Amino acid sequence: PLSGTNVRILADVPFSNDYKNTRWFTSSSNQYNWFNSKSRVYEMSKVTFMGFRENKPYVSVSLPIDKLYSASYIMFQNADYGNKWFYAFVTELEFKNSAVTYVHFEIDVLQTWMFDIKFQESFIVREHVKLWNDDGTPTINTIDEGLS
Amino acid sequence: TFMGFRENKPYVSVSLPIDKLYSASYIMFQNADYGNKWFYAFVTELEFKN
Amino acid sequence: STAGNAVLQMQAMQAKQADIANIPPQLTKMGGNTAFDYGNGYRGVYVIKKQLKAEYRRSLSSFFHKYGYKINRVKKPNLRTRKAFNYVQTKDCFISGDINNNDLQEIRTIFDNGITLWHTDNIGNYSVENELR
Amino acid sequence: TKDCFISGDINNNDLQEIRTIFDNGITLWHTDNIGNYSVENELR
């Protein structure tokens, strides 16, 4: 995403590029409010992303590698998608000089497009099902787990 | 004039910035030499020139 | 990540662990006492129609609906039989026509890998009936 | 372990590596005589 507005670099975001775990939200607002609640390491009102070439995309952050260790996440808006929030992983730190630092990123296809996806009928290997009926009687699940 | 000159990756030169081409999914075009046949192609990837 | 091996793994995860015998282990004890049988009204032949549990019907029906039946015969494939979609997977398929052998060779692999062919613009909506015609 | 979960205040890259370490199996020593399996290795 060429340009960015209202940029914030975020710490304390637990999930990573593994996509084994993520935080699921109820509304576009709830999404933003959760992310809003973190301890803000860095802020900018406008940003020109300039990594655009080979692919590593990045940002130029004006604080040394020290104090920037806590960096975990980036959220930013764009002029063309209105007030849609873009969410991105902080993949890598790279050496610039010793007073301003390069903070590179990876757009989170889950968090970003989260409410923009529609899930259709699909074969599902595992999921969490309803366990108990109203009566207190167990729901019927007989699929052979194949477990001792 | 298509210029994906290397055998294995062809492209077109589009005179509008990369940010605006995310929605791009597909390409259809005719050729003067094959009459009114329509050619259909996936938009595999976007690459930044300027 | 082809559609074919995707289905194969799906076949593997719901793989038939055992057949349902339907031979009562108490068959042996049923006769012998005529006074018992005719007293409780056991007489003549009974036709007992059995069908799989509802849970597994849903499961198998849903599967069959999306990816059709197992066929294992050589013929020309049903490409437009249903109203909505047709799943088609082939093995060493033969497709001819006036096309450069490079492209033609790619199309063959496409059907060899499995593909769903849609006939309605609502692509991915598997909730339809998808009947014939 | 298998698909283990390890949290804490560590960059998710390193944390992801530690998870794999225990997912791959490891022996954790408590005495300086490392590799000496001849001991009793009882509880406590």
Curated annotation (Swiss-Prot), chain D:
Annotated localization = Virion
Subunit structure, interactors included: Homohexamer; forms a hexameric tube structure with six flexible hydrophobic loops.
Task performed by this protein? Distal (knob) tail protein that plugs the end of the tube before DNA ejection and forms a channel perforating the host membrane during ejection.
Listed name of the protein = Tail knob protein gp9
